Amino acid sequence: NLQRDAIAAAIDVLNEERVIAYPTEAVFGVGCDPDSETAVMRLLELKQRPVDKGLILIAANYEQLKPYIDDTMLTDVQRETIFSRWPGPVTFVFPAPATTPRWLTGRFDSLAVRVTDHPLVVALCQAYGKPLVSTSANLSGLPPCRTVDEVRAQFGAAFPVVPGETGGRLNPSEIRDALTGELF
Amino acid sequence: NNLQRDAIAAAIDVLNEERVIAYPTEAVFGVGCDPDSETAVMRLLELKQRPVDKGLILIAANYEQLKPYIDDTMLTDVQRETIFSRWPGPVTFVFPAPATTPRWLTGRFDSLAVRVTDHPLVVALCQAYGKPLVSTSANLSGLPPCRTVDEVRAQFGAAFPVVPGETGGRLNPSEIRDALTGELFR
């Protein structure tokens, strides 16, 4: 019930249209309600990141991501190639419908997404009912946090953070284009 | 006219036989066929000695005729305005294409080159046909393009089905842009 309790409070923060920290594969990440422009702007403000660069969506399964992307051009063989890498630590850039909020796409007609296998995040997304905008937990110019204590050191002792351990993975970020397979 | 009407009627009969037809374009004469028929397209590729993996161009009387073969859902309203400001016209645009679009049209790509032409004859033909036409220049491999009905007969045969009329006048040609960038494709 600990994790259950942690996810519950986490959902409360998300519903408040606020940013929350939580463990991911290699480091902790910070994220929010992708559907809320106010929440996303709070995340960008916190990371001092320009809205035109675009954000990443992390989810428990591909179904949660589909409404934000357009995979209709991908042949069954291309899909098999992409999907063979999920769930996993691989982010894919997919074209995105014009209906997807520009605060997520940035100045592109695409969106970077990932189906994670990190247990905590999968549980969180499954309970929240949708994907989370997800980026590394760190202030501009600071290195990513690998623990709850490190998140508190950078973001403040009262910054909302889900307890747990990262996956303990030290393989750099791998981002690929869904249409090519080429590193993005 | 009534001969244009008749010319179109016979052209549609050939198209329905899953066969290739020739007709005037803004440039020189072109040849085309039913895009929905793998048999018709293979007949055109064989005729042009063109490999299927290159992809083909679709010409239509209006954008609605092309929508079924392409995916424009990612294009914002400003990008669309940028593309449309150039149609009808001599500009061809490459759009991503759903996996449902036949591979004998896309070639080895997940996109399709299309154009809303302003050539009256072709516009009328497509309007009557009810869908776009695969369209390429009327010339056998290694030969110059045909500019008149007579030149088409010399190259494709005296009985090759050809719609009469005059070429638009616009010499040719073809600027090809990417719907996603608005810039030149490649």
Curated annotation (Swiss-Prot), chain B:
- Catalyzed reactions: L-threonine + hydrogencarbonate + ATP = L-threonylcarbamoyladenylate + diphosphate + H2O
Functional description taken from the UniProt entry: Required for the formation of a threonylcarbamoyl group on adenosine at position 37 (t(6)A37) in tRNAs that read codons beginning with adenine. Catalyzes the conversion of L-threonine, HCO(3)(-)/CO(2) and ATP to give threonylcarbamoyl-AMP (TC-AMP) as the acyladenylate intermediate, with the release of diphosphate. Is also able to catalyze the reverse reaction in vitro, i.e. the formation of ATP from TC-AMP and PPi. Shows higher affinity for the full-length tRNA(Thr) lacking only the t(6)A37 modification than for its fully modified counterpart.
In its miscellaneous comment, the UniProt entry states: TsaBCDE are necessary and sufficient for tRNA(NNU) t(6)A37 threonylcarbamoyladenosine modification in vitro in E.coli.
Q: What is its EC number?
A: 2.7.7.87
Primary residence: cytoplasm
**Which positions make up the signal peptide?**
none
A Gene Ontology biological process term: tRNA threonylcarbamoyladenosine modification
| Subunit details | Interacts with TsaB and TsaD.
Q: Which branch of life, at top level?
A: Bacteria
Looking up InterPro entries in the UniProt record yields: DHBP_synth_RibB-like_a/b_dom, Sua5-like_dom, TC-AMP_synthase, TC-AMP_synthase_SUA5
- Does the keyword Nucleotidyltransferase feature in the UniProt annotation? yes
The knockout outcome noted for this protein's gene is: The knockdown of this gene results in a loss of t(6)A37 modification in tRNAs.
Its EC top class is transferase
Q: Write down any Gene Ontology CC term.
A: cytosol
Keywords assigned by UniProt, alphabetized: ATP-binding, Cytoplasm, Nucleotide-binding, Nucleotidyltransferase, Ribosome biogenesis, RNA-binding, rRNA processing, Transferase, tRNA processing, tRNA-binding
The record's family statement is:
Belongs to the SUA5 family. TsaC subfamily.
Q: Could you tell me which residue ranges the YrdC-like domain spans?
A: 5-186
| GO MF annotation list | ATP binding; double-stranded RNA binding; L-threonylcarbamoyladenylate synthase; nucleotidyltransferase activity; tRNA binding
Name-wise, this protein is Threonylcarbamoyl-AMP synthase
Q: What subcellular locations does the record give?
A: Cytoplasm
What's the impact of mutating R50A? Answer: Loss of activity
Q: Which HAMAP family match?
A: TsaC
